[PDB]
Structures are given as C-alpha cells and as structure tokens.
C-alpha cells in the first residue's frame, strides 16, 4: 500500500553559554564526527542529543566523508543556532 517511514531526527541547537554544551570527538575508524560530553540541561540535551549520537549533516549538507576540522568549522561558523542530522546508536541495554 502506502510507503514512507521515518528514520533519523531533526534537532535545532541554540547557542546559550560558552557555546554548545556538547562537544565533538574524532573516532579513528568511522567517518564523520560524534557527540561527546553532552551535559544534561543544555542546548544539546534539550534538543535530544546523546553522547553516542553522530553528525551526518549540518545545515543541509552531508558532512560524512568530511573530516573533523571541516565538520566542526561548519558548526562553529554557523553562529548561535545550528542544525545537525543524527542517526544510529541511541542507548545501551537497560533493564528499567
């Protein structure tokens, strides 16, 4: 019948203090960057970002192959607000 399911999530960050609470970490082996050191209550968390989320794009652009210096610069230049497409890990195995 009708096809078309949802995948990733669209979150809009808002620069508040000392920049974005969350940070980036270059992982040797996988492309793009990853979210790490995301404080609870900041712009990232509020938007729904975790320390396992990855940055697929930024401002309507696939920055997967792009290095960590390129992706970061894009988020830094953006200014206060910046968009990022996250898709992948969500949370580890939990009981309750």
Structural domains of the chain ordered from first start: 1-96 (2.30.42.10)
What is the rounded distance in angstroms from the CA atom of residue 53 to the CA atom of residue 30? 13
Which two tokens mark 68? 């960590």
CB 89 within 8 A of CB 54: yes
The torsion defined by the Cα of 61, 82, 38 and 52, in degrees rounded to 10, comes to -20
The single-letter DSSP state of residue 86 is E
Residue whose entry in the numeric block shows the structure tokens 């997967």:
64
Sequence-ordered list of residues with C-beta below 8 angstroms from that of 6, at least 6 positions apart, any chain:
none
């Amino acid at each position: 019948g009708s096809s078309g399911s949802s995948g990733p999530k669209l979150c809009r960050l808002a620069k508040g203090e000392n920049g974005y609470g969350f940070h980036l970490n270059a992982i040797r082996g996988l492309p793009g960057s990853f979210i790490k050191e995301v404080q609870k209550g900041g712009p990232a968390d509020l938007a729904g970002l975790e320390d396992e989320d990855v940055i697929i794009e930024v401002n309507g652009v696939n920055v997967l192959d792009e290095p960590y210096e390129k992706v970061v610069d894009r988020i830094q230049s953006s200014g206060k607000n910046v968009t990022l497409l996250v898709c992948g890990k969500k949370s580890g195995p939990s009981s309750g």
